[PDB]
């Protein structure tokens, strides 16, 4: 089946960080975004079953300017960029996740 430190990425112009609250089905998920929203995130292609995610993982999420209650993932962090951005406080301190 298998034979068949990268630079962290920052939010910008309609894009931010989110905290997965519950894992939905069919490739959906819900993310509490650090804007005051409990948005729903869809998993994009080239990433759907390319990177595996889990509840409790900081997520880089692109938004939909034409649809404010829906959003889609662009990138997932391996718990190191999360602690980093927490130290620089990019995401509000009211959301603390560690492991």
């Amino acid at each position: 089946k298998g034979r068949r430190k990268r630079e962290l990425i920052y939010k910008e112009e309609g894009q931010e960080y989110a905290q997965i609250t519950k894992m939905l089905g069919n490739g959906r998920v819900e993310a509490s975004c650090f804007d005051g929203n409990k948005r729903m995130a869809h998993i994009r292609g080239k990433l759907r079953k390319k990177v595996w995610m889990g509840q409790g993982d900081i997520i880089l999420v692109s938004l939909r300017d034409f649809q404010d209650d829906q959003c889609d993932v662009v990138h997932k962090y391996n718990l190191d960029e999360a602690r980093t951005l927490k130290n620089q406080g990019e995401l509000p301190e009211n959301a603390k996740i560690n492991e």
């Binding site: 869809h42 994009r44 292609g45 759907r48 939909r64 034409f66």
Partner: protein
Amino acid sequence: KGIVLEKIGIESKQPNSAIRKCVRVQLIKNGKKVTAFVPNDGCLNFVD
């Protein structure tokens, strides 16, 4: 004829990963509500 109730992006089927720009539109003639695709790449921002 109809009126755009709002604008949405609906996700494609299984073998194709992409989001297609569509519009939730209310029909004038009978009152029923439906959804409509918008072709021609740069035209959701034309909808208003």
